[PDB]
Amino acid sequence: MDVHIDNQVLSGLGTPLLVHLFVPDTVMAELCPNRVPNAWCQTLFSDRTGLTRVCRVFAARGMLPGRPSHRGTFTSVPVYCDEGLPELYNPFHVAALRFYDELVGELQIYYLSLFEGAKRALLSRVPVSFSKTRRAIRESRALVRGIAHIFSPHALYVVTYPELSAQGRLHRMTAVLGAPEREFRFLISVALRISASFREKLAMQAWTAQQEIPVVIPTSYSRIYKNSDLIREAFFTVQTRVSWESCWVKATISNAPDACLWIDSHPLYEEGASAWGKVIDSRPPGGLVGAASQLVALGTDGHCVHLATTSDGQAFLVLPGGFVIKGQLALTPEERGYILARHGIR
Amino acid sequence: PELMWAPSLRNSLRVSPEALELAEREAERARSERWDRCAQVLKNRLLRVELDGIMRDHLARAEEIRQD
Amino acid sequence: DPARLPRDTGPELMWAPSLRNSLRVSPEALELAEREAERARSERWDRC
Amino acid sequence: GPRFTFFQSSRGHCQIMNILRIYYSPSIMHRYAVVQPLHIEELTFGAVACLGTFSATDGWRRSAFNYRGSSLPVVEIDSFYSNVSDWEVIL
Amino acid sequence: MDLKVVVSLSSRLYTDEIAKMQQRIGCILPLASQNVQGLGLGQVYSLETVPDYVSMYNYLSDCTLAVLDEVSVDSLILTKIVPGQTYAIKNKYQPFFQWHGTGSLSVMPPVFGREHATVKLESNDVDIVFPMVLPTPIAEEVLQKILLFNVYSRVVMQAPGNADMLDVHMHLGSVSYLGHHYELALPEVPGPLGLALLDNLSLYFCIMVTLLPRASMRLVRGLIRHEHHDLLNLFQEMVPDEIARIDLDDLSVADDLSRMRVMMTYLQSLASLFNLGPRLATAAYSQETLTATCWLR
Numbered sequence: 001m002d003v004h005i006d007n008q009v010l011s012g013l014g015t016p017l018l019v020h021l022f023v024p025d026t027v028m029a030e031l032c033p034n035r036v037p038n039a040w041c042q043t044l045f046s047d048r049t050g051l052t053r054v055c056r057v058f059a060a061r062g063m064l065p066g067r068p069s070h071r072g073t074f075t076s077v078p079v080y081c082d083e084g085l086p087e088l089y090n091p092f093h094v095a096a097l098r099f100y101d102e103l104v105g106e107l108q109i110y111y112l113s114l115f116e117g118a119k120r121a122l123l124s125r126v127p128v129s130f131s132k133t134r135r136a137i138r139e140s141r142a143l144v145r146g147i148a149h150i151f152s153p154h155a156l157y158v159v160t161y162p163e164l165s166a167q168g169r170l171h172r173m174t175a176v177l178g179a180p181e182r183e184f185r186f187l188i189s190v191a192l193r194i195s196a197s198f199r200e201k202l203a204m205q206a207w208t209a210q211q212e213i214p215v216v217i218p219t220s221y222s223r224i225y226k227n228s229d230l231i232r233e234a235f236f237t238v239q240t241r242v243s244w245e246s247c248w249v250k251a252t253i254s255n256a257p258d259a260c261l262w263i264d265s266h267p268l269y270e271e272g273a274s275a276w277g278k279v280i281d282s283r284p285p286g287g288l289v290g291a292a293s294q295l296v297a298l299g300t301d302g303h304c305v306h307l308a309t310t311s312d313g314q315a316f317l318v319l320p321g322g323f324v325i326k327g328q329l330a331l332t333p334e335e336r337g338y339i340l341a342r343h344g345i346r
Numbered sequence: 347p348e349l350m351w352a353p354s355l356r357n358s359l360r361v362s363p364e365a366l367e368l369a370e371r372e373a374e375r376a377r378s379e380r381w382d383r384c385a386q387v388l389k390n391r392l393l394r395v396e397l398d399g400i401m402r403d404h405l406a407r408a409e410e411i412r413q414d
Numbered sequence: 415d416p417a418r419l420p421r422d423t424g425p426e427l428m429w430a431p432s433l434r435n436s437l438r439v440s441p442e443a444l445e446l447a448e449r450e451a452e453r454a455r456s457e458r459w460d461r462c
Numbered sequence: 463g464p465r466f467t468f469f470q471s472s473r474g475h476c477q478i479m480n481i482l483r484i485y486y487s488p489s490i491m492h493r494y495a496v497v498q499p500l501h502i503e504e505l506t507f508g509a510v511a512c513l514g515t516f517s518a519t520d521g522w523r524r525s526a527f528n529y530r531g532s533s534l535p536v537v538e539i540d541s542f543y544s545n546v547s548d549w550e551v552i553l
Numbered sequence: 554m555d556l557k558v559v560v561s562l563s564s565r566l567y568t569d570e571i572a573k574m575q576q577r578i579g580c581i582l583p584l585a586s587q588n589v590q591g592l593g594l595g596q597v598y599s600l601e602t603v604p605d606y607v608s609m610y611n612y613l614s615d616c617t618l619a620v621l622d623e624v625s626v627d628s629l630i631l632t633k634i635v636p637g638q639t640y641a642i643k644n645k646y647q648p649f650f651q652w653h654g655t656g657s658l659s660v661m662p663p664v665f666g667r668e669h670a671t672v673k674l675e676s677n678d679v680d681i682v683f684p685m686v687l688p689t690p691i692a693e694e695v696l697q698k699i700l701l702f703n704v705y706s707r708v709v710m711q712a713p714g715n716a717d718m719l720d721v722h723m724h725l726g727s728v729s730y731l732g733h734h735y736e737l738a739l740p741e742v743p744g745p746l747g748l749a750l751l752d753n754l755s756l757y758f759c760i761m762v763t764l765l766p767r768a769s770m771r772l773v774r775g776l777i778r779h780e781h782h783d784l785l786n787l788f789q790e791m792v793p794d795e796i797a798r799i800d801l802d803d804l805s806v807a808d809d810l811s812r813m814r815v816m817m818t819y820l821q822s823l824a825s826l827f828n829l830g831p832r833l834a835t836a837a838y839s840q841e842t843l844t845a846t847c848w849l850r
Contacts, residue, residue, distance in 0.1 A: 119402070150392055217350060217437065230369050238373050257719065269451040323357075344713035380458070
């Protein structure tokens with residue numbers, strides 16, 4: 001319970017009330033491989049979308065709960081959406097975290113899964129952490145309760161405990177949707193406009209390939225890939241469930257820091273949720289010929305479609321087979337600032 | 347022997363005018379199905395997280411039962 | 415204007431055929447995956 | 463951009479254009495694949511020229527050339543009989 | 554008192570290296586105690602690890618130093634630094650530092666690039682990098698700048714909106730000097746012992762933050778309320794929340810004595826943590842032959 005009293009006196013500037021929680025290792029293992037993170041709070045609104053300041057959450061892992069039943073990581077969620085009096089709760093209201101060590105993996109949590117279980121679980125001197133002395137005397141089992149998670153179907157333990165007035169006001173609060181409805185529709189909107197840009201670039205040209213990346217191709221390429229076999233190019237737009245892991249936003253976050261290339265690569269047909277948001281590097285002493293080795297290793301991928309984004313506002317789609325279709329990236333810069341505030345600072 | 351077309355930048359794809367305009371429409375048809383299936387399982391866990399609230403409120407009202 | 419060749423190996427030149435500029439395709443595995451994924455797509459339509 | 467390479471061989475000129483076409487076999491299709499020779503004058507893949515003869519036994523002992531700052535490797539053909547020739551095009 | 558300490562090699566120091574070794578005569582070298590490896594700084598600063606400037610600073614501060622005086626073939630001689638003796642040191646270092654005021658000279662690892670103070674030894678499989686010698690205040694601001702970068706690279710990377718990573722690389726930038734600005738080498742990861750040094754420094758910082766003298770808060774609040782001093786220019790006429798909220802209480806005579814007493818002992822401990830590496834007090838530096846006569850301070 002070390003992180004509980006570690007960000008309860010630090011996050012009190014940006015947030016009135018702080019919640020203490022657990023994440024099991026089993027539920028967040030598909031967020032990040034090999035438990036590489038060791039956070040950033042950004043609660044987005046359901047009907048009142050906007051943008052909010054980012055709050056920092058101190059989390060430390062590898063340390064168990066008081067229960068021996070499950071052993072997982074520690075976390076905390078700030079609650080600061082409730083304007084003025086926090087007696088109102090916003091229902092169907094997400095809270096999004098950016099847990100990280102070196103930014104990797106994302107977590108989304110409803111306020112309703114949080115708050116329903118929070119009521120369910122119930123000549124100087126040196127300065128003393130009065131919260132630390134008050135935390136130490138509870139030390140019991142029923143402070144922690146297991147609550148199912150609506151995003152990912154697992155039990156997420158919250159630890160609340162009759163500590164002080166700050167949690168004391170918390171369980172007395174009650175009040176009388178569309179928060180994940182927007183982010184899917186937004187990403188599919190920009191994916192539809194990108195596929196329309198590729199449609200008009202294939203239309204103003206002949207229906208042909210320019211083949212930016214060289215790779216050798218067999219004679220049976222029109223057989224083993226059928227005539228107008230755009231099955232992957234059909235279903236590409238359904239396969240992009242994520243955006244903030246995608247390389248599509250990696251160009252927009254890298255405009256201010258200069259310009260490299262980013263790759264969203266997907267399986268020809270359901271071979272696995274492959275890869276999102278990687279780098280093609282010209283900075284290190286691998287150099288431009290080292291980046292060209294990566295790009296020909298990209299074009300030689302015979303079982304994956306590829307999408308390329310540049311940081312300067314251009315988008316490409318590399319077919320398996322070295323073929324490519326040029327395209328444009330440009331969008332209304334309100335959504336640029338929207339994504340830039342969704343990730344971090346403007 | 348097996349013959350492989352050498353990479354030149356005049357190597358064209360097999361010409362595809364009719365490929366994509368039905369493809370994006372059937373893609374969005376599958377996409378809406380994916381989205382409302384995910385919204386259905388979201389609403390199922392959402393009704394299961396709200397249902398224990400009214401039962402906890404009823405078990406809180408069962409306190410006043412014990413003194414009557 | 416293409417030209418058809420069996421083999422080569424390992425150039426520095428970017429537009430030059432090789433074994434390393436050969437795309438590793440398997441028609442059998444991709445077709446089975448497609449045929450099965452098509453079945454999965456078909457089963458995806460009739461849940462709504 | 464063009465390149466100036468140097469070739470040592472123990473064979474004839476008739477042999478040297480055949481084996482130099484075979485040596486430049488990836489580079490011709492490289493230059494063809496990146497740039498289509500849209501006109502008639504871009505077909506020539508340069509030319510070669512015999513610079514003369516030397517002994518095939520103690521030829522081309524490797525050495526080094528030092529400037530004040532750095533040093534590159536450099537071949538040292540010893541006892542050269544210089545005899546230039548006209549340019550024979552490679553295609 | 555012996556000084557003439559030879560270091561026996563095991564292979565032929567070729568004439569490509571004899572020229573640059575005779576070029577580096579009168580410089581300073583750290584000792585191990587000789588064997589061909591461990592006599593220099595390449596034993597702890599290799600190409601395989603990050604240049605951390607703390608573990609090599611630990612090797613400079615733990616073991617003693619030596620002047621190079623003569624380099625023969627197959628063997629070279631070294632002259633130690635025992636105290637009470639006046640050693641004459643020439644400024645043979647590629648980032649030049651003019652010793653006008655002739656302050657206390659100070660050893661440093663080559664934080665201005667490995668390439669200027671390295672020597673390529675192809676006789677034996679060893680490379681020797683020379684320590685950097687420069688006066689004390691430039692040395693201390695190099696220490697504070699390299700620890701500030703070693704603590705701030707991670708926290709600029711830790712932000713999700715890292716629009717400015719290059720802000721610190723120019724803000725820290727060069728070293729602060731009037732006649733010329735000299736850029737240095739900046740490592741991304743501080744490494745183990747650099748983080749141990751920041752850990753001990755954080756220990757000391759959070760211990761002394763438990764006792765703040767409240768009396769100077771009233772004086773800086775008054776100087777804000779009075780004319781803006783040029784030393785106050787970092788505040789630009791602003792009272793932050795912390796200094797506004799540590800001054801709700803009163804000012805007395807009781808807390809101040811014990812506060813300033815433990816501040817005396819903890820600032821003497823911090824000077825002992827900043828008396829870091831061997832230093833050389835300098836008297837009678839003759840500029841016309843570039844020799845700084847020094848005894849081991």
